[PDB]
Symmetry: C6
Subunit: 120 residues, 6 copies
């Protein structure tokens, strides 16, 4: 209903967010792999600010971030730790007019009681 | 009309559910039946049970989907000995917040039908 | 306009049905193969009934079926003989709410004066 | 506006028709012309003539499509020495019942143009 | 706004026209090729006339053509020289009812001050 | 709201613009950053400057896109040492006439960010 990313000491209004995890399955349909993925894909409005891009281009240190989902009270909160921005796009279209879509790849993601942690 | 998933001691309203099975053919059926993955689409709440069930434990589980019309129980898809093998959650201010996940199970059953994998 | 499948001693209202046949063509565009395909793809409403699925999962014997197409009088009739259900999907979507799509692979299909018969 | 296929001693109303031809190019045209398959889309009736013509016999045939406007004959695509190499019939209560089929022919002709395959 | 193809001593009203050119780029994103493409794709109404097709099927000699773009005065003009029709489709659909789409591959294309010329 | 490209000593109204960058990952980021191509979509006029800049010369160039809201300058994407590596112009009586082209540049800059290729 409302989603607020805390990132790089700033807040951004989230238009849309998705994260996904997967395990392989063999022929007999038995799970045949550990869990992989956990990339977070975020979509936020553009302003004069270039902090997200700077965070990808201008430095090399891992970061943390926080998305808080609300209704109308904090419903739940997706956080990541030790991540890097691995995909960035900014788009203007004079017809949501100006926006950024970027993906974080992080060693740890957490939300409510769940934790996913990569093999690094 | 209405579908109710019973999973992990909780109930979830099903926005959409699909399960499928297939056999190969040659140039004549040429294989045993495979697939039987169940794909479920449910609303998100404060709950993280589905994901916890994927990430936080390793033990197979059972689940139950009950399909209804107007008011009784029309039929019921159950699985046994399954694992969540695909999860995605999406938020979009434009159904606002939802989970789509896939169960891979050794046994699925509905009405009089039973499908059971070679394990 | 109205299509009625007779299958497994029951009748089902057909939402949609398609069957297809094909022959290869070489470079010069000459037909370069016998006719293959003839799979029938059927789409019917779900009820409490699980006969179609049972017919795929619970037994192994070939079957016959019959689709009668009407207008408003029997217009024509697609029949198959010695077939097997090789693909099944059932879908519920609380937005046609609940339906089955399945494919029959059969040694013989017939409609009006046409007959197609596989090499088995 | 209106298209009428004459085939197998019968007439069929054409919902849609396309034919195409092409030549390859290199990094300059680099091939003779190929294709010339005709793709036809017509209403289904009690008739099974088109399918019978594919399944039940083996002899090449001719056909004729006449394109009209308002009332005469605008132009006419004809084929000679062809075979039906693809057939699909579809019923859908939502054009309700139709056939889509492809003719592969040695010769197609329309207005002053002629295309003829290397056979 | 209005586009008029002059071709084979006739004029045709252009429903739509597109041409495109491209150069490869390496990993470092440096251009890594000369310019290629320059095929023109044209879309015109069908009449009783079969001149375009005849030009593809019935002869083998290169040709020239001219598209004039207007507003409401000639805005600019795409011309080609030494070209061949390498793709033709005609479509009727009783739902633009009857039309031709064809592609010209030409050694030289020119528009305003630009010229592109293939290696033949 | 409004975007103005300054290129080849002229200005063009931007219908749409996108630029993107990415890094590969392994089974963890596993590459330096690549991409940074800018994709621009502008109206056609009597002008052929963009195409001339691709076809008629061979020297790298710079350009400037200024993004605005309501009235000042919100931010500005600039490139340096670039080449037009993809051009398409389309006319369609149904935006009627437009150009879509891609710039590949050694350096792009916007607000405080800078991206620079390994050349």
């Amino acid at each position: 209903f409302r989603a607020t990313l805390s990132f790089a000491g700033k807040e951004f209004d989230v238009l849309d967010c998705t994260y996904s995890l997967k395990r392989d399955v063999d022929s007999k349909g038995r799970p045949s792999s550990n869990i992989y993925g956990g990339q977070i894909r975020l979509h936020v409005e553009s302003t004069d600010d270039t902090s997200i891009l700077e965070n990808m281009t201008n430095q090399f240190k891992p970061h943390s971030g926080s998305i808080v989902f609300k209704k109308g009270a904090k419903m739940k909160e997706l956080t990541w730790e030790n991540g890097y921005i691995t995909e960035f796009t900014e788009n203007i279209d004079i017809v949501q007019p100006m926006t950024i879509t970027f993906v974080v790849s992080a060693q740890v993601i957490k939300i409510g009681g769940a934790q996913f942690e990569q093999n690094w």
